[PDB]
Write a protein that binds this ligand. Structure first.
Ligand SMILES: Nc1ncnc2c1ncn2[C@@H]1O[C@@H]2CO[P@](O)(=S)O[C@H]2[C@H]1O
Ligand SMILES: Nc1ncnc2c1ncn2[C@@H]1O[C@@H]2CO[P@](O)(=S)O[C@H]2[C@H]1O
Ligand SMILES: Nc1ncnc2c1ncn2[C@@H]1O[C@@H]2CO[P@](O)(=S)O[C@H]2[C@H]1O
Ligand SMILES: Nc1ncnc2c1ncn2[C@@H]1O[C@@H]2CO[P@](O)(=S)O[C@H]2[C@H]1O
Lengths: 150, 627, 627, 150
């Protein structure tokens, strides 16, 4: 039993990453209302606790931070703002469970679209790091593999 | 051999049967069927020949009595108002859909050439032999493209299609018999609710008028008269369901209001002249906290960097571009304003010109600023955003736990009943795609945060340790009464307020709480377990009966992941399986609200909460209560 | 697109998937699959190209790891000892059978031309997506005819095929692992038992020798050596099962005895030279009332019209033609004899020259006559056929009900164990088709009538009403003890004797019977209820455990209707579904006899019954006991 | 609930008639070992108690005569002997159930093969009458319809 948490601002691609990992978009219909909606066997059983859709409810992210053992901090390399939104989530993680260290990875999502790119690999590298794409399925599984390793 | 296949089923000899079976093995339409199935069909399959092109096998609207395979020649699939939509050739089969769904034929079948041969299996034989075995997708085609895809999920249901073909499907399959009222309405509901995504009123209304006036291109005068009359009764039925789904929302749509007014004139004229629509005409005549409407006007303050403000007066559903233009009218500017939302903690978001109805999407203590881009980083929050500096314990301490929870639940029901089901769709697929407000949903969602921050605010503003233990106790009681009234939303809001970092920090307060209430709370907290898709919450709500307020953040999450998890279009066709998934989630809400819910000082307090929503402020206050 | 289809499954993007799916819709091999299934396959289907004709996809004998669809080009299906058996073209699929049955490939697949393209789905993906959906009959073909038809009844089982292809199938799928001994033998049993109907030893024995010496036409030297070694172990296994099924019946078949003797020489020579067959060779070395054999000789009396007779000495399995010729040798005739069976009641049946082993098919008191046809209507029965005129009550009255029933059941077990399972097959399909005796089955079936007529005889020969009530009582007790010993056959025989018209007539005797035994009997009688296919009997026998003697008339009825209800050949192929149905009925008998069963005067009596079987005589006697 | 009985010598076509009525040969496999093997709904539920295969066990035909309410006496119009075998079965019927009248029909089966014919329609007519064929499915249902009418 593991519990990984997906964090970041809206429009970053958290929900896409979550579905693309646990099942896959378009190959199967996705029903988010069933006991196994966010559980995948990987030899470990992972639940993905994702904040997509509930970012306005800060109690929701705190509840998941409390239960989360690994953390993905996702931004869009097409957006400035989302990258800058990242310092605070990292900080809030250390506060809810009362600790010092927590396993986590920084994710630069949407890497496939580079004619719209405004953040560089460098900036994310300066800031575990991965440049991924949920839709292009680049580095989707890797994200959640790293966190079981941490 | 044709003789053999012409003999009635019961007149075939054992060697006739053997000879027939060996020939069945050379037929590609039967190739996926078992040996067992094909020897059964040997005794039941009919050979049918017709000499003349233009011979009619069956007509649109008729009962489905047979399934056919073409052995020789070709047929035209003919639909009223479209002519020949496709042609089927040697090896193709047709007629299965009507048979299996017990629905009318959706097309006529007409011989395209002289001398066509068919294998036919009649209904009772098809249902005993082939019903759960002849399981091929039904793919209806028009000008060599799929237009409707139906599958066994026992009937074939719509999986995908074009907007027009989906409408045609749902219209035709309406059953008008009164004993079927509820069943018919249920079948129409997915389309009636979800059409805004794939067939907005601009397209749907003209389609409905066209369908209303449709005439058959085949049959005696009486048959034609009866077909077209029932067609009109079917269109009227759909309009009635469509009109009912919108209710008061129709006023926001001029196209839709104009359609319905003219449709009422059509039907009342036709009712008179045709002596028809006796039941449906009066139904239609009827149709031709209070909810906020997108056309309601707001007086809204929009701030400058120097903390002066402009008051604009614009529709609730105004876009950001419309806000900017109104602000420029009053400041007399041409200096490139942007609109930024600012939170009490100083967190800023630039809004897009595209964004609509943004007023109700501010945080509890959020404000809207207008400024040139160069001012973005220098904006600072207003004192009024920072919340109260003194408690209100002296007021609500003197109020019963039960009265508070009841007045909370009453107000919560007004807010929840103000939310139109369509707002859930608009919110999920994105407001700008519809240019509709979700103001009611927005304010109901914000209530969850207000209650939560109310808890944290009052605990953190309570200096005396002893009274603070009594606060913890009273909130735990308020929550218990909320859960008893089936207000699960406000119950979790209090529980989560109690879980906030600034409150859970207070060991001297929690340590001192009677372990009776420590156990109550520990249990409430376990109900929030996210484990196995919130199983603890899910099963809890599942046991409860209609008048209930669900845990709204999880509803929004469900909707979000339904939308993101599933493609709206599949091969350029509407993914109707996704449409039903979304519509199911919204009918869950309809179910929660299907039964009604059964002290002016308590009322006034509960409805006028003043709250700190700056988490930094609350943690600073917490740390100085208990270092 | 080929790039896309070449990308590993996990590297396909959402738009790759969409593009792939739209192309899947143009593939006829997937046309019967759901939308749901085809979008799953979009993420899993592999595109495979090969440039050169003669390229090998897989070899005969290998594990089934993939299912294929041909997109472009063609392939040869190649089988050791037969070369190219068929060719598959664009749109055909192959490789499903090995995958699903977890069996070895039955053929190699070789590219027939340059540049062939394939869609491939690998095993774990096939089993999760396609296993209960890709349900097409497997039809193996050779020189454009079906040779094997297999279906899901979870594996594809043989429904029909040619004798040679069925043998090839059952040989190849033998599993040699000791942990699978029982499972392997069970799978072979239908073929081993039923081959006499569709592949007699004259054909099977040469086929087995040919298979024993078969060599692969592909592979390195070691691979070829190992294949051919395991092939030989598989043939040996089948021969061992075949030899065991016959047991002592092999002596009746000179072809089969000669085959097995020479096969033993082959295997012992090969064992030495190849250092193989360490376990199987000694097993084979072993193989290289008592049952009557078809080659046993009988001394049989054949009567003239004047009631003199000839004694002939002929094999038990002699045909009627052989009987006639033996009679003519002794009467020195050339005057066109016919053989007629004559019953004690004077009923006559002319036998056909064709009929074999007729001696044991006479009624209890039947005799055989030889005569010219002109004498047929004038034949009259012999005094010796008419049965006893005095009872034996004074003998068996003094014997315990329990001793009688036990000695009856002991004798019945000797008779029942004398019946070879193959006699049930020969009896069902007709003795002349095999030229085999069913002497043991015949005598065991006649026992049912002997017991039945014993009852009627003793009741009807009992003049004193009082002692006759005691007879009725004692038979009811004998029956109860038979049913306790699980001898259901002899139990029903007594009950049915008691039901005979001549016994049920006797109201003064039944009226006088203690109602304790009236109730016992009324219950026995209800157990015989033919209602719902003898449900009362069926469920009774079902509850019992192995050492039991079933109700034999119903077993014969079951077999009869299995044979008459079902065609032996379907489209010139063996109907193997029928073969299994017959074989199941015979293994029911094997089960009944799978556990052993656990007073010289009683023994002698029970084994030397003298009986009246002339129903007229018995009714006449009955009517004068009680008018 | 009805119970019809099929009688006659061996090789007459009793079993074929029975299967051809209750289910059909070759269109479906025939399993004689199940509760419904000889039951057909026709509006009446018929069981066919057939003596095919058990003619040598006279107790079997007597048991069925006892339970039978209608009777088919079948012969082959290719056989002399079978026609002559018929007088006695008729007589045995009246004896087992102790009656005077019993509903029954006389059936001349195998009527399709007339290059092998030795009995005429006349002889059977002299002797309810039907000339049928189990394999050619001539008059199969009629046989058992007549008996429910009687
Ligand atoms: N059975 C049938 N159903 C519908 N149209 C038919 C028909 N047989 C002939 N037609 C004619 O074919 C024409 C095709 O174009 P329409 O405007 S649907 O009108 C149709 C009729 O005039
Ligand atoms: N575009 C289309 N609309 C309706 N029916 C169509 C069609 N394309 C093909 N058909 C076939 O025409 C048949 C008309 O009767 P059905 O039982 S609705 O089944 C229909 C299909 O088999
Ligand atoms: N993969 C393969 N499996 C079997 N035979 C093959 C093969 N590739 C080539 N062949 C040859 O094709 C020949 C066809 O006839 P054969 O007597 S089975 O011998 C065969 C081999 O010599
Ligand atoms: N006569 C035959 N014998 C064996 N395989 C055959 C055949 N005719 C066609 N095949 C195909 O060749 C394939 C060889 O591998 P399989 O998993 S046994 O599945 C087989 C069938 O798809």
């Amino acid at each position: 039993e593991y519990k990984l948490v997906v964090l970041g601002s809206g429009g970053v691609g958290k929900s896409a990453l979550t579905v693309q990992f646990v099942q896959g978009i378009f190959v199967e219909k996705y029903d988010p209302t069933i006991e196994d909606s966010y559980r995948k066997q990987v030899q470990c059983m992972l639940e993905i606790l994702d904040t997509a859709g509930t970012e306005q409810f800060t109690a929701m992210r705190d509840l998941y931070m409390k239960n989360g053992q690994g953390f993905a901090l996702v931004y869009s390399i097409t957006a400035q703002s989302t990258f800058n939104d990242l310092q605070d989530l990292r900080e809030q993680i250390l506060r809810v469970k009362d600790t010092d260290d927590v396993p986590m990875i920084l994710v630069g999502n949407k890497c496939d679209l580079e004619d719209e790119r405004v953040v560089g690999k460098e900036q994310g590298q300066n800031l575990a790091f991965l440049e991924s794409s949920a839709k292009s399925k680049i580095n989707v599984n890797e994200i959640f593999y790293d966190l079981v390793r941490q | 051999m044709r003789m053999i296949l012409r003999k009635p089923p019961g007149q075939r000899t054992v060697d006739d049967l053997e000879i027939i079976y060996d020939e069945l093995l050379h037929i590609k339409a039967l190739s996926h069927l078992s040996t067992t199935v094909k020897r059964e069909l040997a005794g039941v399959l009919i050979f049918e020949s017709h000499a003349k092109g233009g011979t009619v096998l069956f007509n649109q609207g008729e009962e489905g009595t047979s399934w056919y395979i073409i052995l020789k020649g070709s047929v035209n699939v003919v639909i009223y108002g479209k002519g020949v939509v496709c042609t089927l050739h040697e090896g193709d089969d047709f007629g299965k859909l009507a048979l299996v769904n017990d629905a009318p034929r959706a097309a006529s079948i007409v011989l395209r050439e002289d001398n066509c041969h068919f294998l036919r299996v009649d209904k009772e034989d098809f249902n005993r032999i082939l019903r759960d075995v002849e399981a091929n997708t039904v793919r209806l085609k028009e000008h060599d493209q799929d237009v409707l895809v139906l599958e066994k999920v026992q009937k074939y249901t719509v999986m995908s299609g074009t907007p027009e073909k989906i409408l045609e499907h749902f219209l035709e399959t309406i059953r008008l018999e009164p004993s079927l009222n509820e069943a018919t309405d249920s079948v129409l509901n997915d389309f009636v609710m979800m059409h805004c995504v794939f067939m907005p009123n601009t397209q749907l209304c003209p389609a409905l008028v066209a369908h209303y006036h449709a005439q058959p291109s085949q049959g005696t005068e009486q048959e034609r008269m009866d077909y077209a009359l029932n067609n009109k009764r079917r269109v009227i039925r759909l309009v009635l369901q469509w009109a009912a789904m919108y209710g008061d929302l129709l006023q926001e749509d001029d196209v839709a209001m104009a359609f319905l007014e003219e449709f009422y004139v059509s039907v009342s004229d036709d009712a008179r002249m045709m002596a028809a629509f006796k039941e449906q005409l009066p139904e239609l005549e009827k149709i031709v906290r209070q909810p906020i409407r997108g056309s309601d006007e707001v007086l809204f303050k929009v701030y400058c960097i120097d903390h002066t403000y402009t008051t604009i007066r614009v529709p609730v559903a105004a876009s950001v571009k419309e806000v900017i233009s109104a602000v420029a009218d009053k400041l007399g500017s041409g200096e490139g304003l942007i609109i930024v939302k600012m939170n009490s903690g100083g967190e800023k978001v630039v809004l897009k010109s595209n964004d609509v109805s943004v007023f109700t999407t501010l945080t509890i203590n959020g404000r809207l600023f207008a400024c040139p881009r160069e001012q973005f980083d220098s904006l600072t929050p207003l004192p009024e955003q920072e919340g109260p500096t003194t408690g209100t314990v002296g007021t609500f301490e003197l109020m019963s736990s039960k009265d508070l929870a009841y007045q909370m639940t009453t107000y919560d029901w007004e807010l929840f009943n103000c939310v139109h089901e369509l707002e859930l769709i608009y919110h999920t697929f994105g407001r700008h795609n519809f240019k509709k407000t979700t103001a009611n949903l927005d304010l109901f969602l914000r209530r969850f945060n207000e209650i939560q921050f109310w808890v944290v605010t009052e605990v953190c503003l309570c200096s005396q340790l002893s009274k603070r233990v009594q606060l913890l106790k009273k909130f735990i009681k308020i929550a218990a009464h909320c859960k008893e009234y089936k207000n699960l939303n406000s119950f979790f809001a209090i529980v989560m307020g109690l879980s906030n970092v600034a409150v859970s920090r207070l060991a001297l307060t929690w340590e001192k709480l009677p372990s009776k209430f420590k156990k109550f709370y520990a249990e409430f907290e376990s109900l929030m377990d996210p484990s196995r898709n919130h199983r603890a919450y899910r099963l809890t709500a599942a046991k409860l009966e209609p008048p209930l307020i669900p845990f709204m953040p999880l509803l929004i999450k469900d909707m979000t992941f339904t939308h993101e998890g599933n493609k709206t279009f599949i091969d350029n066709l509407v993914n109707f399986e996704k449409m039903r998934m979304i519509a199911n989630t919204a009918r869950t809400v309809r179910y929660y609200r299907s039964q009604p819910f059964n002290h002016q000082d308590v009322r006034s307090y509960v409805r006028q909460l003043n709250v700190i929503d700056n988490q930094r402020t609350l943690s600073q206050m917490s740390h100085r209560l208990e270092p």
